[PDB]
Structure 1
């Protein structure tokens, strides 16, 4: 697989990414100690995940570009830009983990939870953000898509930040209100907090690198990718509760955390006044006796079937979008991504 294959070269390029970002220490040894911490920040936070968003940039670049323009440098820039997406993600996860008072990320202790870190991780998160642009300058300054990538990563940060503000306003840290749990809000949080940075940003970066800078091509790609974003999160929320924790490699947290999940949204859309009250109680509770009750109400409301139906219609919808908006790009750009997301 394009992904399974290149995952090695992508992860092996990280050694250079680090060497390169820890090279301004040469002229200024005065800040060596801060760069030593900056190294530790990257090693701990950019490494450990699936690298799929970062890999998408590499994969999409190969697919969008004529094989003769794929020289040593072009690929060095594709891996780098791929890494910038991972670095952007590392910056959000470090900060999101602080904000939601989390204990683990990828089964490991959250960076801020590590001794000697704590709220210093707020600065660490900022340094991860700074590196996107440091690399972008180091590898793409002379490229004609340079300004386009800076603006893309910047728009992408803003979009996520807006999404996060929306999420935070919707599900506060100790507020059992389901009035603000509307589908219009769920769809909105997903567009801003996840869909944009996870699906639009990686393909869009490759597009700019390929010379595809047109507003219409990007609008067409944005149309397709944002809908893939929407499904990804809906499936993520379904799998959170009904997924097999062996294959998923994670156990259900959603209900216990008062999350505006797709499941609750649907539950709230299809619930008798008493069923609303049953939820109004058991939601946001750490107690296994209470978590079991919601799981049971969702099941009673045939949400696994409502999800199955949604998955069918969604894949049917994405194909319609790919048909309509992929042109003039290679449909494979989108088809490859959809295959990895759907089942």
Structure 2
């Protein structure tokens, strides 16, 4: 509810984000209208967890007497920058994976009269981050630190995307689905921008700019990010859609935690069943896969992993949170846990 409290004013701020990004240069009006449409379609409709973490962390990291009106405008804005980063990645990712829907809406690129123009639209969303940072934060001591953090985050995510694309050519081979490779993908592709970025942005805005402090936060948050993606992979199969969307990882030939662990623990005659069934449109095949996972006690393996993980994270928060308040980590953990 620390998140539920901030959410009202966060989403309300979006209206202003859009105003300023379309606010002189009359010749480009039509392009700016297109920009407006891209923002409204792509940046709105999710949970906004990543953005909100910026604002919640800011509240927990700054003396309450130094949380003036301006400071809060800036914290909302950087939060919206995180959401724009995410929109950039997802618009582009949806093209690369030939996805149909995102958030139960037709993917932007699939809207008629959009198509591959969405590539430029994604790029504009990335541009908007640095426009906002300039408009709201150029005079601040942390300005350069945020620019570099956003850029570093894009690069990390892109490297991760490269690994994903090398790992599952859309021509998939299960020999490539290893744990070391699974961990790298999650780390570079999701954990950095999802878990490290928002807290880091908040750290910098509160004057916490030390390498060791950042290294400590990053150690905790990367492991949080690892856990939560593995949790998403599991829920994709063994969840209920009410609890979670509907799961399609198997028919999609994904390098999912489930498949990875399956491969580690199998006699030679179980690879040559999974080969047979993994990635097929038909549903009798998708059931064979689930039933194999079930026969391999992968819930149990998950449960054991969930325990080791909770323990290790709490230990890390004990060691490395200081001098940040532990509730910064603990809150995010509680909030993402599904």
TM-score when scaled to structure 1? Answer: 0.97
- Tell me whether 1:105 sits opposite 2:108 in the alignment: no
| Post-superposition CA distance 1:126-161 (Å, at most 9, x none) | 000000000000000000000000000000000000
- Report the CA distance between 1:342 and its aligned residue: 3.3
Write the distance in 2 (CA, Å) between the matches of 1:125 and 1:92.
7
- Report the CA distance between 1:176 and its aligned residue: 2.9
Segments of 5+ residues of structure 2 without an aligned counterpart are: none
Contact 1:176 1:283 in 2 (8 A): no
- Report the CA distance between 1:6 and its aligned residue: 1.1
Q: How many residues align?
A: 337
Q: Which moved more, 1:331-340 or 1:161-170?
A: 331-340
Q: Which moved more, 1:192-201 or 1:310-319?
A: 310-319
| Post-superposition CA distance 1:237-283 (Å, at most 9, x none) | 000000011121x1111111111000000000011100111111101
| Post-superposition CA distance 1:8-36 (Å, at most 9, x none) | 111000000000100xxxx1010000000
Write the distance in 1 (CA, Å) between the matches of 2:242 and 2:281.
22
- Report the CA distance between 1:39 and its aligned residue: 0.1
| Post-superposition CA distance 1:174-223 (Å, at most 9, x none) | x2311111100000000000000000000000000000000000000000
How much is the aligned-residue C-alpha RMSD, in angstroms? Answer: 0.6
Write the distance in 1 (CA, Å) between the matches of 2:195 and 2:247.
24
State the SS of the aligned residue for 1:143: coil
Contact 1:163 1:188 in 2 (8 A): yes
Contact 1:94 1:110 in 2 (8 A): yes
Write the distance in 2 (CA, Å) between the matches of 1:299 and 1:10.
42
Corresponding position of 1:235: 231
| Post-superposition CA distance 1:283-320 (Å, at most 9, x none) | 11111011000000000001111111111111111001
Write the distance in 2 (CA, Å) between the matches of 1:78 and 1:255.
39
Write the distance in 1 (CA, Å) between the matches of 2:258 and 2:281.
18
Segments of 5+ residues of structure 1 without an aligned counterpart are: none
Write the distance in 1 (CA, Å) between the matches of 2:63 and 2:248.
45
TM-score when scaled to structure 2? Answer: 0.99
- Tell me whether 1:75 sits opposite 2:72 in the alignment: yes
Write the distance in 2 (CA, Å) between the matches of 1:176 and 1:211.
46
Contact 1:170 1:260 in 2 (8 A): yes
Q: Which moved more, 1:299-308 or 1:218-227?
A: 299-308
Contact 1:176 1:280 in 2 (8 A): no
Write the distance in 2 (CA, Å) between the matches of 1:294 and 1:5.
42
Write the distance in 1 (CA, Å) between the matches of 2:114 and 2:85.
20
Corresponding position of 2:288: 293
Write the distance in 1 (CA, Å) between the matches of 2:336 and 2:315.
16
Write the distance in 1 (CA, Å) between the matches of 2:197 and 2:228.
15
Write the distance in 2 (CA, Å) between the matches of 1:328 and 1:176.
46
Write the distance in 1 (CA, Å) between the matches of 2:276 and 2:5.
48
Contact 1:315 1:342 in 2 (8 A): no
